[PDB]
Amino acid sequence: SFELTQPSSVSVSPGQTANITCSGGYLGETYRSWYQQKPGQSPVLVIYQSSKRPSGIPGRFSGSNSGNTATLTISGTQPLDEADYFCQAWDFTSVVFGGGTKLTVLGQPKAAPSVTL
Amino acid sequence: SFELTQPSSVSVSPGQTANITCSGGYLGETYRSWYQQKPGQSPVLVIYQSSKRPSGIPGRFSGSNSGNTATLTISGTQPLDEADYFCQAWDFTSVVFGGGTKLTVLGQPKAAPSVTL
Amino acid sequence: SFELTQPSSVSVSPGQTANITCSGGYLGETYRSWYQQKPGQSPVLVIYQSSKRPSGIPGRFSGSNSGNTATLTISGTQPLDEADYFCQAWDFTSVVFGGGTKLTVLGQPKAAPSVTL
Amino acid sequence: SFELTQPSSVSVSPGQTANITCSGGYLGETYRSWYQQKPGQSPVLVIYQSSKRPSGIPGRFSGSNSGNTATLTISGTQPLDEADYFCQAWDFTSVVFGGGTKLTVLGQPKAAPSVTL
Amino acid sequence: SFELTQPSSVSVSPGQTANITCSGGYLGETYRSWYQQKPGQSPVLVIYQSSKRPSGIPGRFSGSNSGNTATLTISGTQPLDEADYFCQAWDFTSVVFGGGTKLTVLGQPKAAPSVTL
Numbered sequence: 171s172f173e174l175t176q177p178s179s180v181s182v183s184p185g186q187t188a189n190i191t192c193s194g195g196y197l198g199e200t201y202r203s204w205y206q207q208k209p210g211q212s213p214v215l216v217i218y219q220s221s222k223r224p225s226g227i228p229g230r231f232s233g234s235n236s237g238n239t240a241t242l243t244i245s246g247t248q249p250l251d252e253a254d255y256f257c258q259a260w261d262f263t264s265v266v267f268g269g270g271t272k273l274t275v276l277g278q279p280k281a282a283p284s285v286t287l
Numbered sequence: 288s289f290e291l292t293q294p295s296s297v298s299v300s301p302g303q304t305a306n307i308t309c310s311g312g313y314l315g316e317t318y319r320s321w322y323q324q325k326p327g328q329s330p331v332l333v334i335y336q337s338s339k340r341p342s343g344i345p346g347r348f349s350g351s352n353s354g355n356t357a358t359l360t361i362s363g364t365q366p367l368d369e370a371d372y373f374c375q376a377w378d379f380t381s382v383v384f385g386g387g388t389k390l391t392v393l394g395q396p397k398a399a400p401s402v403t404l
Numbered sequence: 405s406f407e408l409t410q411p412s413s414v415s416v417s418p419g420q421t422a423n424i425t426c427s428g429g430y431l432g433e434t435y436r437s438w439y440q441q442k443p444g445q446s447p448v449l450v451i452y453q454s455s456k457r458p459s460g461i462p463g464r465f466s467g468s469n470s471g472n473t474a475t476l477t478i479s480g481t482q483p484l485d486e487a488d489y490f491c492q493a494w495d496f497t498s499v500v501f502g503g504g505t506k507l508t509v510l511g512q513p514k515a516a517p518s519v520t521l
Numbered sequence: 522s523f524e525l526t527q528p529s530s531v532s533v534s535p536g537q538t539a540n541i542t543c544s545g546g547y548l549g550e551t552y553r554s555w556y557q558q559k560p561g562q563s564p565v566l567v568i569y570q571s572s573k574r575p576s577g578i579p580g581r582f583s584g585s586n587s588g589n590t591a592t593l594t595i596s597g598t599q600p601l602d603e604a605d606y607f608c609q610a611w612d613f614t615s616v617v618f619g620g621g622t623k624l625t626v627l628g629q630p631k632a633a634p635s636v637t638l
Numbered sequence: 639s640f641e642l643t644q645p646s647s648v649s650v651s652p653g654q655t656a657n658i659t660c661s662g663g664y665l666g667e668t669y670r671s672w673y674q675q676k677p678g679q680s681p682v683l684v685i686y687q688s689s690k691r692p693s694g695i696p697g698r699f700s701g702s703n704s705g706n707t708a709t710l711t712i713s714g715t716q717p718l719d720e721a722d723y724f725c726q727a728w729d730f731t732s733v734v735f736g737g738g739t740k741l742t743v744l745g746q747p748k749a750a751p752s753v754t755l
């Protein structure tokens with residue numbers, strides 16, 4: 171008995187494994203005594219945007235593009251009292267193969283073995 | 288008895304496994320004594336946008352594009368009292384193969400073995 | 405007895421497995437004593453948008469596009485009292501193959517083995 | 522006895538499995554004593570939009586497009602008292618093959634083995 | 639009995655494994671006694687943007703681009719009282735193969751061994 175084996179393998183198989191975890195902990199409070207006197211509370215916030223004849227990517231192609239043109243983002247800016255943000259903003263971006271990618275697996279093997287017994 | 292095997296494998300099979308978890312913890316409160324006096328509460332917020340003759344991507348193609356033109360985003364900005372945000376904003380973006388991708392697996396093997404016994 | 409096997413496999417089979425979980429925890433409150441005096445509560449919010457002759461993607465094709473033209477998004481901005489957001493906004497975007505993708509599996513094998521016993 | 526087998530397999534079969542779960546936890550309250558005095562409550566909110574001669578995607582095709590033209594979204598902005606949002610907004614978008622995709626499996630094998638015993 | 643094996647392997651399979659974890663710790667408070675007197679609270683914030691005839695990437699292609707054009711980002715700037723940010727902003731960007739990448743695996747082996755016994 172004989173064993174002849176030729177597993178020709180042209181394979182592309184990348185892969186990622188991830189463990190993600192958050193615990194807010196222990197928030198314990200005993201005998202918290204409070205006397206609060208705050209009359210006449212008057213907070214102010216003004217947000218303004220104006221734009222005229224803008225343009226973006228006015229030319230030839232981009233293979234991949236995550237970037238922006240003139241924009242405005244506002245987050246958690248003016249918290250006044252007892253404001254909690256716990257594990258608040260979790261942003262995960264995972265890409266195996268990006269945009270505009272060419273995979274051309276051009277496999278044309280020739281294999282002619284023999285066994286004489 | 289003989290064994291001849293040639294599992295020619297032209298295969299593309301990438302893959303991701305993920306564990307995601309959040310626990311708000313323990314929020315315990317005993318004998319919290321409070322006396323609050325806050326007459327005449329007058330908070331203010333003004334948000335304004337104006338735009339005229341804008342344009343975006345006025346040209347040739349983009350393989351892939353997540354970016355924006357002039358926009359405005361407002362989040363959790365003016366919390367006044369007892370405001371909690373726990374594991375609030377979770378954004379996951381997972382792509383195996385992006386846009387505008389070409390996979391051309393052109394497999395034309397030739398294989399003629401033999402066994403003489 | 406002999407064994408000859410050639411499982412020629414031109415296969416594309418990527419795949420993702422995910423575990424997602426949230427627990428709000430333990431929110432326990434004992435002997436919480438409160439005396440609240442808040443007459444004359446007058447909060448204000450104004451949101452304004454105006455747009456004139458805008459345009460977007462006024463050209464050749466996009467393979468894939470998630471981006472926007474001038475828009476406005478407002479979230480959880482002005483919470484006044486006892487406002488809770490727990491595991492509130494969960495956004496998952498999963499794509500195996502994006503838009504404008506070409507898979508051309510052009511498999512034309514030739515295989516003529518033989519066994520002489 | 523002999524075994525000859527050639528399972529030529531040109532197959533595309535990607536697939537995703539997902540576990541999704543939320544538990545609001547334990548919300549326990551004992552001996553909560555409250556005396557609330559809030560006469561003359563007058564909250565205000567104004568939301569305004571105007572648009573004139575807008576246009577979107579005024580050109581050649583898009584393979585796939587999830588993006589918008591000038592719009593406005595308002596969510597959970599002005600909660601005044603005892604407002605709870607638990608696992609409130611869950612948005613899942615899962616695509617195996619996007620729009621404008623071409624799968625051309627052009628399989629024309631030739632296979633003529635033989636066994637002489 | 640003899641063993642002949644030639645597993646010719648032209649394979650590209652990179653992969654990353656990650657452990658991510660946060661614990662807010664222990665936040666314990668006993669006999670916290672407070673007397674607060676803060677009448678006439680008047681905070682102010684003004685945010686302004688104006689833009690005219692801007693442009694971005696007005697030329698030939700970019701293989702990959704994450705960069706922006708003139709934008710403005712505001713975060714956690716003006717917290718007034720009792721403001722907590724715990725494991726607040728977690729941003730992970732993982733790419734195996736970037737955009738505009740060419741993988742051309744052009745495998746054309748020739749292999750004709752033999753065994754005479």
Ligand SMILES: *[C@@H]1O[C@H](CO)[C@@H](O)[C@H](O)[C@H]1NC(C)=O
Pocket residue numbers: 187188189190306655
């Ligand atoms: C971490 O992930 C591995 C697999 O990568 C798994 O065996 C283990 O259970 C995970 N541990 C935790 C604490 O999530």
Ligand SMILES: *[C@@H]1O[C@H](CO)[C@@H](O)[C@H](O)[C@H]1NC(C)=O
Pocket residue numbers: 187304305306307423
């Ligand atoms: C982590 O994921 C692995 C598989 O990747 C699984 O065995 C395990 O149960 C998971 N553990 C937790 C704590 O989620």
Ligand SMILES: *[C@@H]1O[C@H](CO)[C@@H](O)[C@H](O)[C@H]1NC(C)=O
Pocket residue numbers: 304421422423424540
């Ligand atoms: C995690 O997922 C694996 C499969 O990926 C499964 O065996 C296990 O039950 C899951 N565990 C939890 C805690 O969800």
Ligand SMILES: *[C@@H]1O[C@H](CO)[C@@H](O)[C@H](O)[C@H]1NC(C)=O
Pocket residue numbers: 421538539540541
């Ligand atoms: C997780 O999913 C696996 C299959 O993916 C299943 O065996 C298991 O029951 C699930 N566990 C939970 C806790 O949902």
Ligand SMILES: *[C@@H]1O[C@H](CO)[C@@H](O)[C@H](O)[C@H]1NC(C)=O
Pocket residue numbers: 189655656657658
């Ligand atoms: C760390 O990850 C390894 C696999 O990379 C796993 O065995 C282990 O459980 C993880 N440990 C923790 C504490 O997450």
